[PDB]
């Protein structure tokens, strides 16, 4: 029931790789510091989102077995998860404990960042649904890896190969859940339940960037490739 | 091609 030695090695390795990410405080200190125009915020979004993809590619290449997968399946997994991984990381940063009234301010800042009204509620409803589960850093790290190695994506040719890589991560995560929350025997299942709501953010990701309240929507070549914009 | 940059980041190193 307790993490095996193989599971403890897997977990610590996923944690190290996950830890190579931009410090949350860097992101929130800036948003809180002062109010920016919808234009300055659109630019902050594109630079953060370009850096997020670059780090995600490095995190993914380190996942045990990912490099043994067919090359075309490797691109399909990365392309299929990149936007979901971005919102999951945004949800993590959003629910990090801040000084009194700071998350209120962070929330007011994001609300008036330039994003369209139609996307506000679903986004904050998702970030809130995430904050309700009170996830640990190990849970965020494992859930990101599970999101990336989803064998039920589109354009995946060899699904059973992906399943084989995702299963040990699900098993470690399940054990952590049955420890971090013995009183919530539904914790593992709700974490998996959130993954379904996250897929809904895929439906309109391109439109979320396009409807931002700016006169022009300039993106980087890499973002154009990942999000489905030009 | 279609995911030229993504293919590069994955195939470098
Ligand atoms: O690499 C990383 O570790 C990383 C972390 C966070 C982000 N995300 C962002 O920068 C944007 C800002 C970007 C500047 C404007 C405010 C939102 N962001 C979004 C959002 C809103 C809309 C869309 Cl379409 C995507 C994301 N939700 C947020 C909730 C927050 F608590 C927060 F702090 C930032 C948040 C990221 F890109 C990368």
Short mmCIF file of C-alpha atoms and ligand atoms in Angstrom, two decimals:
data_model
loop_
_atom_site.label_atom_id
_atom_site.label_comp_id
_atom_site.label_asym_id
_atom_site.label_seq_id
_atom_site.Cartn_x
_atom_site.Cartn_y
_atom_site.Cartn_z
CA UNK A 1 0.00 0.00 0.00
CA UNK A 2 2.91 2.38 0.83
CA UNK A 3 4.95 3.61 -2.15
CA UNK A 4 7.32 0.85 -3.34
CA UNK A 5 11.05 1.77 -3.92
CA UNK A 6 10.38 1.92 -7.67
CA UNK A 7 7.40 4.25 -6.96
CA UNK A 8 9.46 6.51 -4.66
CA UNK A 9 12.18 6.79 -7.36
CA UNK A 10 9.51 7.58 -10.01
CA UNK A 11 7.86 10.24 -7.79
CA UNK A 12 11.15 12.01 -6.85
CA UNK A 13 12.25 11.97 -10.49
CA UNK A 14 8.88 13.53 -11.66
CA UNK A 15 9.24 16.13 -8.84
CA UNK A 16 12.75 17.17 -9.93
CA UNK A 17 11.68 17.58 -13.56
CA UNK A 18 8.51 19.42 -12.50
CA UNK A 19 10.66 21.71 -10.30
CA UNK A 20 12.56 23.10 -13.35
CA UNK A 21 9.56 25.45 -13.85
CA UNK A 22 9.19 29.21 -13.51
CA UNK A 23 8.69 30.11 -9.87
CA UNK A 24 4.97 30.88 -9.23
CA UNK A 25 5.89 34.05 -7.21
CA UNK A 26 7.65 35.47 -10.35
CA UNK A 27 4.23 35.26 -12.20
CA UNK A 28 1.97 36.54 -9.33
CA UNK A 29 4.39 39.22 -7.97
CA UNK A 30 4.26 40.85 -11.45
CA UNK A 31 0.42 40.62 -11.93
CA UNK A 32 -0.16 42.01 -8.39
CA UNK A 33 2.63 44.73 -8.58
CA UNK A 34 0.55 46.97 -10.89
CA UNK A 35 -2.36 47.02 -13.36
CA UNK A 36 -1.39 46.62 -17.00
CA UNK A 37 -3.48 47.42 -20.06
CA UNK A 38 -5.16 44.57 -22.04
CA UNK A 39 -2.24 45.06 -24.54
CA UNK A 40 0.55 44.64 -21.96
CA UNK A 41 -1.32 41.61 -20.52
CA UNK A 42 -1.73 40.02 -23.98
CA UNK A 43 2.09 40.32 -24.37
CA UNK A 44 2.75 38.88 -20.89
CA UNK A 45 0.39 35.97 -21.82
CA UNK A 46 2.23 35.16 -25.09
CA UNK A 47 5.71 35.19 -23.45
CA UNK A 48 4.55 33.09 -20.47
CA UNK A 49 2.73 30.69 -22.83
CA UNK A 50 5.83 30.38 -25.16
CA UNK A 51 8.10 29.67 -22.15
CA UNK A 52 5.51 27.20 -20.73
CA UNK A 53 5.54 25.09 -23.96
CA UNK A 54 9.41 25.05 -24.04
CA UNK A 55 9.58 23.80 -20.41
CA UNK A 56 6.71 21.29 -21.04
CA UNK A 57 8.63 19.76 -24.03
CA UNK A 58 11.69 19.31 -21.72
CA UNK A 59 9.50 17.90 -18.88
CA UNK A 60 7.84 15.46 -21.36
CA UNK A 61 11.14 14.18 -22.92
CA UNK A 62 12.15 13.19 -19.36
CA UNK A 63 8.98 11.10 -18.71
CA UNK A 64 10.07 7.40 -18.47
CA UNK A 65 9.58 5.77 -21.86
CA UNK A 66 8.40 8.87 -23.82
CA UNK A 67 11.43 8.78 -26.16
CA UNK A 68 10.76 5.09 -27.08
CA UNK A 69 7.30 6.07 -28.44
CA UNK A 70 6.79 6.48 -32.18
CA UNK A 71 7.95 10.05 -33.17
CA UNK A 72 4.59 11.02 -34.67
CA UNK A 73 2.83 9.80 -31.49
CA UNK A 74 5.33 11.93 -29.48
CA UNK A 75 4.19 15.10 -31.35
CA UNK A 76 0.47 14.09 -31.05
CA UNK A 77 0.79 13.68 -27.21
CA UNK A 78 2.60 17.03 -26.86
CA UNK A 79 0.27 18.92 -29.20
CA UNK A 80 -2.81 17.32 -27.54
CA UNK A 81 -1.80 18.28 -23.96
CA UNK A 82 0.07 21.56 -24.17
CA UNK A 83 -2.93 23.88 -23.63
CA UNK A 84 -4.47 21.67 -20.87
CA UNK A 85 -1.05 21.60 -19.10
CA UNK A 86 -0.97 25.42 -19.33
CA UNK A 87 -4.39 25.81 -17.58
CA UNK A 88 -3.49 23.17 -14.98
CA UNK A 89 -0.29 25.07 -14.12
CA UNK A 90 -2.33 28.39 -14.14
CA UNK A 91 -4.86 26.70 -11.73
CA UNK A 92 -1.94 25.61 -9.44
CA UNK A 93 -0.48 29.16 -9.38
CA UNK A 94 -3.97 30.65 -8.78
CA UNK A 95 -4.64 28.47 -5.70
CA UNK A 96 -1.22 29.03 -4.05
CA UNK A 97 -1.75 30.71 -0.62
CA UNK A 98 -1.02 34.41 -0.71
CA UNK A 99 -1.12 37.26 1.93
CA UNK A 100 -4.63 38.63 2.95
CA UNK A 101 -6.74 39.86 0.02
CA UNK A 102 -3.97 39.08 -2.53
CA UNK A 103 -5.84 36.23 -4.29
CA UNK A 104 -8.84 38.64 -4.50
CA UNK A 105 -6.54 41.16 -6.21
CA UNK A 106 -4.91 38.45 -8.37
CA UNK A 107 -8.41 37.32 -9.31
CA UNK A 108 -9.58 40.95 -10.10
CA UNK A 109 -6.40 41.49 -12.15
CA UNK A 110 -6.93 38.29 -14.26
CA UNK A 111 -10.69 39.14 -14.67
CA UNK A 112 -9.75 42.61 -16.12
CA UNK A 113 -6.67 41.39 -18.06
CA UNK A 114 -8.40 41.68 -21.47
CA UNK A 115 -9.82 38.11 -21.69
CA UNK A 116 -13.44 37.97 -23.08
CA UNK A 117 -16.41 37.61 -20.67
CA UNK A 118 -17.60 34.28 -22.15
CA UNK A 119 -14.35 32.61 -20.87
CA UNK A 120 -14.13 34.16 -17.38
CA UNK A 121 -16.68 32.00 -15.49
CA UNK A 122 -15.62 28.60 -17.02
CA UNK A 123 -11.96 29.49 -16.26
CA UNK A 124 -12.56 30.64 -12.66
CA UNK A 125 -15.09 27.78 -12.20
CA UNK A 126 -12.28 25.38 -13.23
CA UNK A 127 -9.56 27.11 -11.13
CA UNK A 128 -12.04 27.00 -8.18
CA UNK A 129 -12.92 23.30 -8.77
CA UNK A 130 -9.11 22.70 -8.64
CA UNK A 131 -8.62 24.69 -5.43
CA UNK A 132 -11.42 22.65 -3.72
CA UNK A 133 -9.32 19.43 -3.92
CA UNK A 134 -6.42 21.18 -2.07
CA UNK A 135 -3.75 19.37 -4.17
CA UNK A 136 -0.12 18.89 -3.20
CA UNK A 137 2.89 19.73 -5.44
CA UNK A 138 3.39 15.95 -6.04
CA UNK A 139 -0.28 15.75 -7.15
CA UNK A 140 0.14 18.67 -9.60
CA UNK A 141 3.36 17.04 -10.97
CA UNK A 142 1.86 13.56 -11.40
CA UNK A 143 -1.43 14.97 -12.88
CA UNK A 144 0.59 16.99 -15.46
CA UNK A 145 2.47 13.82 -16.50
CA UNK A 146 -0.85 11.84 -16.64
CA UNK A 147 -2.38 14.63 -18.83
CA UNK A 148 0.61 14.47 -21.22
CA UNK A 149 0.60 10.64 -21.46
CA UNK A 150 -3.17 10.41 -22.24
CA UNK A 151 -3.52 7.42 -24.61
CA UNK A 152 -7.05 8.46 -25.59
CA UNK A 153 -5.96 11.52 -27.59
CA UNK A 154 -6.64 12.10 -31.29
CA UNK A 155 -4.04 11.04 -33.90
CA UNK A 156 -2.49 8.51 -31.50
CA UNK A 157 -1.68 5.37 -33.53
CA UNK A 158 -0.25 3.06 -30.83
CA UNK A 159 -2.47 3.64 -27.75
CA UNK A 160 -1.39 0.57 -25.80
CA UNK A 161 2.24 1.89 -25.76
CA UNK A 162 1.00 5.21 -24.19
CA UNK A 163 -1.25 3.26 -21.68
CA UNK A 164 1.84 1.32 -20.50
CA UNK A 165 3.63 4.61 -19.65
CA UNK A 166 0.59 6.32 -18.04
CA UNK A 167 -0.41 3.32 -15.78
CA UNK A 168 2.61 3.55 -13.34
CA UNK A 169 1.90 7.28 -12.88
CA UNK A 170 -1.83 6.63 -12.16
CA UNK A 171 -0.76 3.90 -9.63
CA UNK A 172 1.66 6.24 -7.74
CA UNK A 173 -0.90 9.03 -7.80
CA UNK A 174 -3.65 6.71 -6.46
CA UNK A 175 -1.44 5.67 -3.49
CA UNK A 176 -0.60 9.32 -2.66
CA UNK A 177 -4.37 10.14 -2.72
CA UNK A 178 -5.14 7.20 -0.35
CA UNK A 179 -2.63 8.80 2.09
CA UNK A 180 -2.94 12.62 1.69
CA UNK A 181 -6.69 12.05 2.15
CA UNK A 182 -7.86 8.82 3.98
CA UNK A 183 -11.11 10.79 4.82
CA UNK A 184 -11.66 11.52 1.09
CA UNK A 185 -11.73 8.01 -0.47
CA UNK A 186 -13.02 9.88 -3.54
CA UNK A 187 -9.90 12.13 -3.85
CA UNK A 188 -8.20 10.02 -6.50
CA UNK A 189 -11.45 9.89 -8.50
CA UNK A 190 -12.17 13.68 -8.18
CA UNK A 191 -8.54 14.47 -9.38
CA UNK A 192 -9.34 12.27 -12.43
CA UNK A 193 -12.71 14.01 -12.68
CA UNK A 194 -10.99 17.41 -13.02
CA UNK A 195 -8.99 16.05 -16.04
CA UNK A 196 -12.32 15.76 -17.90
CA UNK A 197 -13.32 19.39 -17.20
CA UNK A 198 -9.81 20.46 -18.30
CA UNK A 199 -10.45 18.90 -21.79
CA UNK A 200 -13.35 21.44 -22.18
CA UNK A 201 -10.72 24.29 -22.23
CA UNK A 202 -9.41 22.73 -25.46
CA UNK A 203 -12.68 23.41 -27.30
CA UNK A 204 -12.19 27.22 -27.33
CA UNK A 205 -8.43 27.81 -26.64
CA UNK A 206 -7.83 29.47 -30.08
CA UNK A 207 -10.87 31.80 -29.52
CA UNK A 208 -9.67 32.67 -25.99
CA UNK A 209 -6.55 34.23 -27.47
CA UNK A 210 -8.37 35.72 -30.54
CA UNK A 211 -11.13 37.47 -28.58
CA UNK A 212 -8.64 39.16 -26.20
CA UNK A 213 -9.50 42.92 -26.09
CA UNK A 214 -6.58 44.22 -28.17
CA UNK A 215 -6.49 45.75 -31.72
CA UNK A 216 -4.04 43.06 -32.89
CA UNK A 217 -3.24 39.43 -31.94
CA UNK A 218 0.41 38.76 -32.70
CA UNK A 219 1.74 35.33 -31.58
CA UNK A 220 5.15 33.64 -31.73
CA UNK A 221 5.74 30.89 -34.40
CA UNK A 222 5.85 28.24 -31.63
CA UNK A 223 2.52 29.43 -30.10
CA UNK A 224 0.88 29.43 -33.54
CA UNK A 225 1.93 25.78 -33.79
CA UNK A 226 0.66 24.75 -30.31
CA UNK A 227 -2.48 26.86 -29.98
CA UNK A 228 -4.33 26.84 -33.15
CA UNK A 229 -3.75 30.43 -34.21
CA UNK A 230 -1.92 32.45 -36.90
CA UNK B 1 6.35 20.79 -41.73
CA UNK B 2 3.08 21.29 -39.80
CA UNK B 3 4.72 21.02 -36.36
CA UNK B 4 8.24 21.93 -37.54
CA UNK B 5 9.20 23.77 -34.34
CA UNK B 6 7.66 21.15 -32.04
CA UNK B 7 9.39 18.37 -34.06
CA UNK B 8 12.69 20.32 -33.64
CA UNK B 9 12.37 20.73 -29.81
CA UNK B 10 11.62 17.01 -29.51
CA UNK B 11 14.34 15.81 -31.98
CA UNK B 12 17.25 18.05 -30.74
CA UNK B 13 19.60 16.94 -27.84
O1 LIG C 1 4.90 28.45 -16.91
C1 LIG C 1 4.22 28.72 -15.97
O2 LIG C 1 4.59 28.28 -14.76
C2 LIG C 1 2.97 29.51 -16.21
C3 LIG C 1 2.11 29.85 -15.17
C4 LIG C 1 0.96 30.60 -15.40
C5 LIG C 1 0.63 30.96 -16.72
N1 LIG C 1 -0.52 31.71 -16.95
C6 LIG C 1 -0.54 33.05 -17.21
O3 LIG C 1 0.48 33.72 -17.31
C7 LIG C 1 -1.88 33.71 -17.36
C8 LIG C 1 -1.85 35.24 -17.15
C9 LIG C 1 -1.14 35.93 -18.34
C10 LIG C 1 -1.17 37.46 -18.20
C11 LIG C 1 -2.62 37.94 -18.08
C12 LIG C 1 -3.27 37.30 -16.84
C13 LIG C 1 -3.29 35.77 -17.08
N2 LIG C 1 -2.84 33.10 -16.42
C14 LIG C 1 -4.05 32.53 -16.73
C15 LIG C 1 -4.54 32.37 -18.11
C16 LIG C 1 -5.58 33.16 -18.57
C17 LIG C 1 -5.99 33.05 -19.87
C18 LIG C 1 -5.37 32.17 -20.75
CL1 LIG C 1 -5.95 32.08 -22.40
C19 LIG C 1 -4.27 31.45 -20.33
C20 LIG C 1 -3.86 31.52 -19.01
N3 LIG C 1 -4.65 32.14 -15.64
C21 LIG C 1 -3.88 32.42 -14.58
C22 LIG C 1 -4.03 32.24 -13.20
C23 LIG C 1 -3.01 32.67 -12.37
F1 LIG C 1 -3.14 32.50 -11.05
C24 LIG C 1 -1.88 33.30 -12.86
F2 LIG C 1 -0.91 33.74 -12.03
C25 LIG C 1 -1.71 33.47 -14.20
C26 LIG C 1 -2.71 33.04 -15.06
C27 LIG C 1 1.46 30.60 -17.76
F3 LIG C 1 1.17 31.02 -19.01
C28 LIG C 1 2.63 29.89 -17.52
#
